[PDB]
Amino acid sequence: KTAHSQGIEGKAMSEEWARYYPRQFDSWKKTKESDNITDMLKEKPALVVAWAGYPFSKDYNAPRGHYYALQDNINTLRTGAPVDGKTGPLPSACWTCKSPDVPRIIEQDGELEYFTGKWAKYGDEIVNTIGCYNCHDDKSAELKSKVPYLDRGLSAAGFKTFAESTHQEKRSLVCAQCHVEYYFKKTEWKDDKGVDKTAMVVTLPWSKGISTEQMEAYYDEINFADWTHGISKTPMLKAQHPDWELYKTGIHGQKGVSCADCHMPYTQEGAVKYSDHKVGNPLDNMDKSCMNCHRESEQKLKDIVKQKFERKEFLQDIAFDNIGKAHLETGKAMELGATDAELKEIRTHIRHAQWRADMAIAGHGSFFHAPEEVLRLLASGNEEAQKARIKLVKVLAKYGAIDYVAPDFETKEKAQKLAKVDMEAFIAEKLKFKQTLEQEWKKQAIAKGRLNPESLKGVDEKSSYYDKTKK
Amino acid sequence: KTAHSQGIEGKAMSEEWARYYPRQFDSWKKTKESDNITDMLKEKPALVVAWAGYPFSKDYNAPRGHYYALQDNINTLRTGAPVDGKTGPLPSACWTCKSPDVPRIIEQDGELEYFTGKWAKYGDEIVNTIGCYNCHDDKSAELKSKVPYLDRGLSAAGFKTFAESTHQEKRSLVCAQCHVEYYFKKTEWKDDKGVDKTAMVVTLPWSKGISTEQMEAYYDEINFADWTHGISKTPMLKAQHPDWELYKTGIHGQKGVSCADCHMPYTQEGAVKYSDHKVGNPLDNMDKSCMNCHRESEQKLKDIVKQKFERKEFLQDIAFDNIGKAHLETGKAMELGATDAELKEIRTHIRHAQWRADMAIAGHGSFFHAPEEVLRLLASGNEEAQKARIKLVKVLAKYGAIDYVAPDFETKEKAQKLAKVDMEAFIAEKLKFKQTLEQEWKKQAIAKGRLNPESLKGVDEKSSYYDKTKK
Ligand code: HEM
Ligand code: HEM
Ligand code: HEM
Ligand code: HEM
Ligand code: HEM
Ligand code: HEM
Ligand code: HEM
Ligand code: HEM
Ligand code: HEM
Ligand code: HEM
Ligand SMILES: O=N[O-]
Ligand SMILES: O=N[O-]
Ligand SMILES: [Ca+2]
Ligand SMILES: [Ca+2]
Ligand SMILES: [Y+3]
Ligand SMILES: [Y+3]
Ligand SMILES: [Y+3]
Ligand SMILES: [Y+3]
Ligand SMILES: [Y+3]
């Protein structure tokens, strides 16, 4: 048994686990070191056009340390500026993969109640970032999935549930609670008090399989759309970090190498073995992350990974350039009078083109996890985009604009103008929210004993719109 | 030293080496087992349209055993039907990578003289197929490159010459004498007797590097074209089995795994080690070809290779479908009156699109040797093809044919009709040649002692146009 066999009071606060596991706590806290904010809309402005009419056209940055998950969820312009617990653009489900307070609340109020309401609903309750309780049982310390939607997805795909999986599989599934593609399913229900409510439930689109094409069929079958494109009015699908799905198709995944083998390598100290909990870039610790299976130089492997990134970049830029042009050309055709009937096939091509390309790039490590599938997906997406553009030339010609040249979107500024994103306004409103409601959330959480001030050290130094210097 | 330190009389006939190396001779001869003829124009009819106006639109089959190299060179419709040593469509250089009689003749008459004249010139001289003398010194049995153009290419690319390379490198370079991309360089010269002659010299386009793009630049710089497309009149480039070039970019190549490690695995018998000379499909001998470096199931690796093939097929069909349509749409524009000036950019896109796609598929094992580069090349080629097609819609529109639909080429028959290939005539002429001149070649070679009748057993049972049942 463990030294906490009766459970851990205050289990949602990872600091509470330090008295039993000081080593794991120490490395876990070190993700604070990965504080880099890479503004992806600045690096890849084409993404702004792709996501026109959707929150991702406002703010979208690369992933950084777990230490910053909760704060980034609060800082992103995507969550807007709530004035109370009933305002703001996004739902309560946006906290789901950012805090150990999520399972705490689910186990307390139930899954449906948790998924009901605005994101602002739990502002002073969900205040701890990715912690021990998100992956460990507080009595046995055993690995555990804390979110019901994962097993539901696994079963739907024909996979074994978490409890039925091997230990090596669990070493990857704990990550899959969050590092997967999902969609919010509007769900009507009624509580014990007999009140009718509507919940937005996190759902893994795996009922037809976990391949990009199978998920595509899943969404088309139910005529689902995350949003109607702001420029082309195409019924769009948003892919979100399908890290596990693509990893499973990659050779490492097929060979049984778990996420943990590279991201949480072991360190042998006598008869005791420790897992590095500083989840980050495995290339910063290759001797432990790779050299236990590969026998040559470090710089060599690094170069090979770099080669993969360059190939992915090459195809990514091509695909999103044509997807961007397709959206704009469709918008132009619309302005000229093109009918929905005349644009139906084109829009279907665009929807599929972007779904495939987004699925390929949304998982930032996919270019390495499943190199070949990523390149194939980008190639497939580009082909669908070009099929749309060939048809668009003809629609444009019918309306007398065969020589139309889609505007350029090579900078975030130019792209957001095309996407009609009033950044100044969104940032201004966001800052007001951070200076008022957010501070009230943190003050109340600290007063109630749900948040330890220590966990806030340097957590809010950066965002895509401000940099106090460094987190 | 060896048991033949003074050389081997009749060295060009591999049978002569059997008295010193019976084991290697026995396995070498077993490539006779790989007698399958896969008609690639039948499997991928799009290739016919791609090669319209070029010999490859007539006959092109997949590679089979070395045992059949010389006979396939004779059987292919590409070499036509010579009536004597001064007729026939192709030059003497076509024998170069098919026989050990090539180095014999080069070492005798000189490289320039060998590369001068028609293919039919050496019909009764070059009669042995890929043999010991193509890779081994007849005194030391050491590995050796017998063709001067390889070192010239290696140096031009910044590589070490064969003699300067390590043994492990030589284990791949002996294959590179033939398994590489090349072009015939028209070369004017004058023999000792003072006669002005023109030679067609095998040249490796590596002066700018061995990547597809570097070779592309090489050809564009000299305004080179293998042929003018029969349909689009585009200045085309033909890629031919760039096996070594792509292998070098693949991970196995970067890791120092030689062609021989997979295709000529070792067998340890006491203190003696033997190399399997039955060059064929490594997957038919995985325990020896792969399991000495990989630790799990055989069916597993096979499945993974199959996965790569499927991805390659997916992108290959897309790319060549758009390349085919582009050629046809250009031809249509031409019929309508489109000028060369109006079609220049389009033709440049087509040339590059096909060069990249052909380079990706011409090496039949490339999908495995360099999986990722192959997918990237097919994606790049397709993009260039689609860029051409977008521009073509506008040219067609100008001439009143915006709704033109390029004809289908889903069967070899339909494709060859579009490419205007009179197969009946070519086959009829070929058979007449085989029944007359070819037989005279073999009879004379046997009479002169250059050919051993034993080597002809079952060598001419199949071709793409006849099958006596099995070779
Ligand atoms: C499971 C052990 C697991 C792995 C592996 C993993 C990886 C991972 C990485 C490499 C990053 C980025 C690191 C960096 O320094 O850039 C990252 C980021 C986030 N993760 Fe994660 N992650 C694993 C597990 C979990 C779990 C269980 C959740 C959900 C509760 C989760 C969530 C996130 C979030 C959110 C981020 C973004 C952090 C930010 O940008 O602020 N991860 N993860
Ligand atoms: C709700 C729609 C929602 C919001 C809002 C949200 C935000 C968010 C941010 C700001 C990041 C950091 C990177 C960025 O700027 O985009 C981030 C990162 C990840 N998220 Fe998230 N997130 C929302 C919902 C969900 C859900 C429901 C899950 C889990 C199923 C999830 C998970 C993650 C993971 C993992 C990452 C890191 C990897 C990556 O590619 O970003 N998020 N999220
Ligand atoms: C939180 C700070 C936290 C603690 C504490 C903790 C402890 C812990 C222990 C004691 C082990 C076993 C010994 C070892 O170091 O291998 C262990 C192992 C793993 N953990 Fe953990 N862990 C904490 C947090 C997290 C988080 C946030 C995740 C999930 C994303 C997670 C995952 C894992 C994994 C996987 C292992 C390895 C299991 C194995 O190989 O046996 N831990 N952790
Ligand atoms: C398992 C399903 C698994 C997860 C989860 C995971 C996540 C992850 C993320 C989120 C990234 C991107 C982080 C970022 O900030 O950009 C990422 C990147 C890499 N990973 Fe990973 N990873 C999983 C599995 C594996 C496995 C099994 C290995 C090792 C074989 C591995 C390695 C890496 C590497 C390398 C990167 C790229 C780092 C870089 O070049 O910047 N991951 N992973
Ligand atoms: C560490 C982050 C790490 C790197 C880097 C790495 C690289 C690597 C490459 C480039 C390949 C080839 C496949 C591809 O094209 O991407 C490859 C293949 C295998 N690896 Fe690996 N690998 C890293 C880590 C690990 C770890 C921790 C293990 C061992 C548990 C591992 C294993 C393997 C296996 C197995 C393969 C498949 C090929 C084979 O040998 O069967 N890798 N890796
Ligand atoms: C070097 C050791 C070397 C390798 C490796 C190699 C491979 C190879 C394969 C796998 C085939 C096809 C086998 C099958 O059964 O399908 C094949 C075919 C041809 N090769 Fe080769 N080859 C190596 C070396 C050489 C050398 C030195 C030459 C040139 C003299 C050469 C040529 C050819 C030819 C021609 C064929 C086609 C045979 C036919 O289809 O009739 N190879 N090779
Ligand atoms: C000259 C233009 C020439 C001819 C003619 C020729 C023919 C030929 C045939 C018929 C095959 C079998 C496959 C098929 O039907 O296409 C074949 C195969 C290979 N060749 Fe060849 N070949 C000619 C020239 C050259 C030259 C100059 C080289 C070497 C530098 C060469 C090499 C090879 C190799 C290797 C193969 C097998 C691999 C493949 O993809 O076909 N050939 N050739
Ligand atoms: C022809 C029938 C032929 C003979 C005879 C022959 C002999 C031979 C010997 C004695 C060796 C060394 C011992 C061993 O089996 O490893 C050897 C090795 C290799 N050979 Fe060979 N060889 C014949 C033909 C060919 C041909 C046509 C090629 C080239 C395409 C070739 C290549 C090689 C290679 C490579 C080796 C391995 C060298 C090493 O690893 O030391 N041989 N051969
Ligand atoms: C080295 C430069 C090298 C050569 C030469 C070579 C040739 C070769 C050919 C011509 C093919 C296609 C044969 C056909 O008839 O289709 C082919 C196919 C495979 N090869 Fe190979 N090969 C070279 C190198 C290597 C190395 C280093 C390995 C092993 C790591 C290897 C393996 C294979 C495999 C597997 C195939 C595909 C077989 C199939 O799926 O049909 N080759 N090679
Ligand atoms: C045999 C023909 C053979 C097969 C099959 C095979 C497969 C294989 C795969 C699928 C990979 C991953 C890279 C990719 O995506 O293609 C891989 C990687 C490595 N291999 Fe291999 N391999 C075959 C043969 C051989 C032989 C004979 C050796 C050993 C000399 C070898 C070695 C390696 C190495 C090294 C890698 C790179 C990854 C790593 O472990 O560093 N393979 N192979
Ligand atoms: O924005 N987290 O999918
Ligand atoms: O047709 N041998 O390149
Ligand atoms: Ca989604
Ligand atoms: Ca060529
Ligand atoms: Y406590
Ligand atoms: Y990062
Ligand atoms: Y690969
Ligand atoms: Y003799
Ligand atoms: Y074959």
Side-chain angles (χ1 to χ4, degrees):
Chain A
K1 63 173 60 182
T2 64
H4 57 84
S5 64
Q6 301 303 299
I8 302 175
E9 198 183 328
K11 61 201 175 187
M13 294 178 282
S14 296
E15 296 85 333
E16 286 294 336
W17 299 61
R19 70 175 297 164
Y20 322 106
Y21 312 114
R23 294 213 67 188
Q24 289 79 1
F25 179 79
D26 189 271
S27 59
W28 166 83
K29 191 172 183 180
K30 290 185 184 305
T31 62
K32 175 185 184 180
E33 286 167 28
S34 301
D35 77 315
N36 160 270
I37 290 291
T38 291
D39 180 338
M40 292 304 296
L41 300 185
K42 187 173 181 179
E43 299 301 306
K44 302 296 186 184
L47 296 178
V48 175
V49 174
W51 299 323
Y54 204 55
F56 279 79
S57 60
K58 300 182 183 178
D59 198 358
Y60 171 59
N61 311 310
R64 56 172 177 168
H66 279 170
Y67 184 85
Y68 304 100
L70 188 82
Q71 194 56 50
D72 287 341
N73 186 238
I74 294 175
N75 292 351
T76 183
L77 297 180
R78 303 207 296 278
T79 47
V83 294
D84 57 35
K86 302 179 181 303
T87 46
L90 306 184
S92 61
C94 286
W95 297 108
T96 312
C97 309
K98 306 287 185 289
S99 164
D101 282 301
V102 171
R104 176 176 68 76
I105 294 179
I106 291 177
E107 306 173 320
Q108 175 187 301
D109 297 303
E111 174 164 39
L112 289 173
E113 179 57 50
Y114 165 70
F115 285 127
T116 298
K118 291 291 187 176
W119 170 73
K121 177 191 180 185
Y122 295 118
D124 82 336
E125 280 298 314
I126 301 178
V127 297
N128 287 278
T129 196
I130 307 166
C132 322
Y133 198 54
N134 278 114
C135 309
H136 295 283
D137 177 280
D138 76 312
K139 292 180 182 178
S140 65
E142 298 173 303
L143 293 179
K144 289 294 188 63
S145 170
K146 308 305 189 73
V147 292
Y149 61 73
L150 177 55
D151 274 343
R152 284 206 287 281
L154 288 172
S155 296
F159 283 105
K160 290 178 280 59
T161 61
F162 186 97
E164 302 169 55
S165 305
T166 69
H167 187 68
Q168 180 67 353
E169 297 181 312
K170 288 177 177 181
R171 280 162 61 63
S172 290
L173 293 177
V174 288
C175 308
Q177 299 181 79
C178 311
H179 285 271
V180 292
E181 145 65 12
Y182 74 94
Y183 79 98
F184 293 153
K185 183 176 184 179
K186 187 173 185 175
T187 307
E188 305 307 316
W189 67 293
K190 184 167 62 179
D191 59 43
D192 49 59
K193 296 183 181 301
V195 182
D196 296 301
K197 296 178 180 176
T198 302
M200 288 298 265
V201 186
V202 173
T203 306
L204 309 188
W206 303 351
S207 67
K208 292 184 178 300
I210 60 170
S211 81
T212 294
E213 292 69 31
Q214 301 173 316
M215 287 188 233
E216 192 179 84
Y218 172 110
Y219 287 123
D220 286 351
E221 188 177 74
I222 54 174
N223 304 299
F224 186 80
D226 286 292
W227 85 103
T228 299
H229 203 269
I231 300 174
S232 64
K233 295 305 177 302
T234 300
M236 308 302 289
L237 292 171
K238 183 75 191 75
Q240 289 104 336
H241 44 63
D243 308 308
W244 184 81
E245 296 95 320
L246 289 185
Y247 144 81
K248 264 298 186 180
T249 68
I251 191 167
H252 281 103
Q254 292 188 57
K255 285 302 185 302
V257 182
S258 73
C259 309
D261 290 312
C262 299
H263 289 287
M264 292 182 67
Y266 297 131
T267 287
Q268 195 62 57
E269 270 181 52
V272 183
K273 182 182 62 182
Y274 298 102
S275 292
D276 190 339
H277 280 64
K278 181 188 173 300
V279 178
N281 189 324
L283 301 180
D284 291 315
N285 183 55
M286 296 188 80
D287 189 296
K288 303 292 293 184
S289 302
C290 316
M291 312 320 223
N292 275 179
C293 300
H294 297 295
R295 295 192 175 188
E296 49 245 309
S297 179
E298 274 181 47
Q299 187 60 60
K300 196 182 185 67
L301 275 183
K302 277 190 174 178
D303 294 311
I304 292 179
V305 175
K306 173 180 174 57
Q307 288 166 38
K308 300 181 182 291
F309 189 72
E310 299 180 308
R311 287 191 286 267
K312 184 276 291 181
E313 288 282 291
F314 176 74
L315 296 187
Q316 182 179 332
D317 289 342
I318 288 169
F320 279 97
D321 188 51
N322 287 317
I323 288 170
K325 290 176 178 176
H327 279 300
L328 293 161
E329 291 161 356
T330 297
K332 177 64 177 185
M334 287 161 59
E335 291 185 2
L336 299 173
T339 70
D340 290 340
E342 295 180 306
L343 299 176
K344 188 175 180 178
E345 284 180 17
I346 284 163
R347 281 166 172 161
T348 296
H349 287 303
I350 292 174
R351 169 188 170 88
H352 289 162
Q354 190 162 310
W355 169 247
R356 300 171 191 182
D358 205 4
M359 273 292 290
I361 70 162
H364 292 275
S366 295
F367 77 96
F368 171 78
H369 301 154
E372 289 162 43
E373 176 66 354
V374 164
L375 300 184
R376 191 195 69 73
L377 286 170
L378 287 168
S380 179
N382 187 57
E383 173 57 9
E384 280 296 310
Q386 290 291 227
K387 281 182 175 184
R389 299 193 63 234
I390 291 293
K391 292 179 176 175
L392 278 163
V393 178
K394 299 177 182 178
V395 174
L396 289 173
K398 172 186 173 178
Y399 290 98
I402 197 170
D403 298 311
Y404 169 74
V405 180
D408 293 303
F409 40 94
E410 84 285 358
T411 68
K412 178 182 178 185
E413 294 57 53
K414 291 173 70 173
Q416 293 189 308
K417 184 174 185 297
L418 292 173
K420 300 173 182 176
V421 180
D422 192 338
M423 289 292 279
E424 289 177 293
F426 289 126
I427 291 174
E429 284 180 288
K430 189 69 175 188
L431 292 176
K432 189 174 182 179
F433 153 74
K434 287 182 60 63
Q435 304 173 311
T436 58
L437 189 59
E438 191 203 338
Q439 301 312 305
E440 293 194 0
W441 285 355
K442 288 183 159 58
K443 291 180 179 180
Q444 296 179 184
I446 291 172
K448 296 183 300 180
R450 291 294 199 299
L451 171 62
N452 188 317
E454 187 73 12
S455 68
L456 303 179
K457 280 190 179 46
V459 81
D460 196 27
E461 310 278 56
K462 309 171 174 180
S463 72
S464 62
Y465 48 102
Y466 65 73
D467 185 337
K468 302 176 181 180
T469 293
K470 188 173 182 179
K471 290 203 175 181
Chain B
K1 63 173 60 182
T2 64
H4 57 84
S5 64
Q6 301 303 299
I8 302 175
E9 198 183 328
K11 61 201 175 187
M13 294 178 282
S14 296
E15 296 85 333
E16 286 294 336
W17 299 61
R19 70 175 297 164
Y20 322 106
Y21 312 114
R23 294 213 67 188
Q24 289 79 1
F25 179 79
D26 189 271
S27 59
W28 166 83
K29 191 172 183 180
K30 290 185 184 305
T31 62
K32 175 185 184 180
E33 286 167 28
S34 301
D35 77 315
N36 160 270
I37 290 291
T38 291
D39 180 338
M40 292 304 296
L41 300 185
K42 187 173 181 179
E43 299 301 306
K44 302 296 186 184
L47 296 178
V48 175
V49 174
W51 299 323
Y54 204 55
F56 279 79
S57 60
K58 300 182 183 178
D59 198 358
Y60 171 59
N61 311 310
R64 56 172 177 168
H66 279 170
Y67 184 85
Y68 304 100
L70 188 82
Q71 194 56 50
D72 287 341
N73 186 238
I74 294 175
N75 292 351
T76 183
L77 297 180
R78 303 207 296 278
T79 47
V83 294
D84 57 35
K86 302 179 181 303
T87 46
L90 306 184
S92 61
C94 286
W95 297 108
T96 312
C97 309
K98 306 287 185 289
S99 164
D101 282 301
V102 171
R104 176 176 68 76
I105 294 179
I106 291 177
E107 306 173 320
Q108 175 187 301
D109 297 303
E111 174 164 39
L112 289 173
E113 179 57 50
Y114 165 70
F115 285 127
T116 298
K118 291 291 187 176
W119 170 73
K121 177 191 180 185
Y122 295 118
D124 82 336
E125 280 298 314
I126 301 178
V127 297
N128 287 278
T129 196
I130 307 166
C132 322
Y133 198 54
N134 278 114
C135 309
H136 295 283
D137 177 280
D138 76 312
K139 292 180 182 178
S140 65
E142 298 173 303
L143 293 179
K144 289 294 188 63
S145 170
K146 308 305 189 73
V147 292
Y149 61 73
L150 177 55
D151 274 343
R152 284 206 287 281
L154 288 172
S155 296
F159 283 105
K160 290 178 280 59
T161 61
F162 186 97
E164 302 169 55
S165 305
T166 69
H167 187 68
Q168 180 67 353
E169 297 181 312
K170 288 177 177 181
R171 280 162 61 63
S172 290
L173 293 177
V174 288
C175 308
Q177 299 181 79
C178 311
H179 285 271
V180 292
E181 145 65 12
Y182 74 94
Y183 79 98
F184 293 153
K185 183 176 184 179
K186 187 173 185 175
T187 307
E188 305 307 316
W189 67 293
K190 184 167 62 179
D191 59 43
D192 49 59
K193 296 183 181 301
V195 182
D196 296 301
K197 296 178 180 176
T198 302
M200 288 298 265
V201 186
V202 173
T203 306
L204 309 188
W206 303 351
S207 67
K208 292 184 178 300
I210 60 170
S211 81
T212 294
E213 292 69 31
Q214 301 173 316
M215 287 188 233
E216 192 179 84
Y218 172 110
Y219 287 123
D220 286 351
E221 188 177 74
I222 54 174
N223 304 299
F224 186 80
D226 286 292
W227 85 103
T228 299
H229 203 269
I231 300 174
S232 64
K233 295 305 177 302
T234 300
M236 308 302 289
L237 292 171
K238 183 75 191 75
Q240 289 104 336
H241 44 63
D243 308 308
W244 184 81
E245 296 95 320
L246 289 185
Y247 144 81
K248 264 298 186 180
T249 68
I251 191 167
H252 281 103
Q254 292 188 57
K255 285 302 185 302
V257 182
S258 73
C259 309
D261 290 312
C262 299
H263 289 287
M264 292 182 67
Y266 297 131
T267 287
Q268 195 62 57
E269 270 181 52
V272 183
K273 182 182 62 182
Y274 298 102
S275 292
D276 190 339
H277 280 64
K278 181 188 173 300
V279 178
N281 189 324
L283 301 180
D284 291 315
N285 183 55
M286 296 188 80
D287 189 296
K288 303 292 293 184
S289 302
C290 316
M291 312 320 223
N292 275 179
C293 300
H294 297 295
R295 295 192 175 188
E296 49 245 309
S297 179
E298 274 181 47
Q299 187 60 60
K300 196 182 185 67
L301 275 183
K302 277 190 174 178
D303 294 311
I304 292 179
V305 175
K306 173 180 174 57
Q307 288 166 38
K308 300 181 182 291
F309 189 72
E310 299 180 308
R311 287 191 286 267
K312 184 276 291 181
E313 288 282 291
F314 176 74
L315 296 187
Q316 182 179 332
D317 289 342
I318 288 169
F320 279 97
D321 188 51
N322 287 317
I323 288 170
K325 290 176 178 176
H327 279 300
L328 293 161
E329 291 161 356
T330 297
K332 177 64 177 185
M334 287 161 59
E335 291 185 2
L336 299 173
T339 70
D340 290 340
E342 295 180 306
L343 299 176
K344 188 175 180 178
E345 284 180 17
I346 284 163
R347 281 166 172 161
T348 296
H349 287 303
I350 292 174
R351 169 188 170 88
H352 289 162
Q354 190 162 310
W355 169 247
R356 300 171 191 182
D358 205 4
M359 273 292 290
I361 70 162
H364 292 275
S366 295
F367 77 96
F368 171 78
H369 301 154
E372 289 162 43
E373 176 66 354
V374 164
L375 300 184
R376 191 195 69 73
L377 286 170
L378 287 168
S380 179
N382 187 57
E383 173 57 9
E384 280 296 310
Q386 290 291 227
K387 281 182 175 184
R389 299 193 63 234
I390 291 293
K391 292 179 176 175
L392 278 163
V393 178
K394 299 177 182 178
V395 174
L396 289 173
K398 172 186 173 178
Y399 290 98
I402 197 170
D403 298 311
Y404 169 74
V405 180
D408 293 303
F409 40 94
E410 84 285 358
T411 68
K412 178 182 178 185
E413 294 57 53
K414 291 173 70 173
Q416 293 189 308
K417 184 174 185 297
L418 292 173
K420 300 173 182 176
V421 180
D422 192 338
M423 289 292 279
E424 289 177 293
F426 289 126
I427 291 174
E429 284 180 288
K430 189 69 175 188
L431 292 176
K432 189 174 182 179
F433 153 74
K434 287 182 60 63
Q435 304 173 311
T436 58
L437 189 59
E438 191 203 338
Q439 301 312 305
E440 293 194 0
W441 285 355
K442 288 183 159 58
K443 291 180 179 180
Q444 296 179 184
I446 291 172
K448 296 183 300 180
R450 291 294 199 299
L451 171 62
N452 188 317
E454 187 73 12
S455 68
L456 303 179
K457 280 190 179 46
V459 81
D460 196 27
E461 310 278 56
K462 309 171 174 180
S463 72
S464 62
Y465 48 102
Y466 65 73
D467 185 337
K468 302 176 181 180
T469 293
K470 188 173 182 179
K471 290 203 175 181

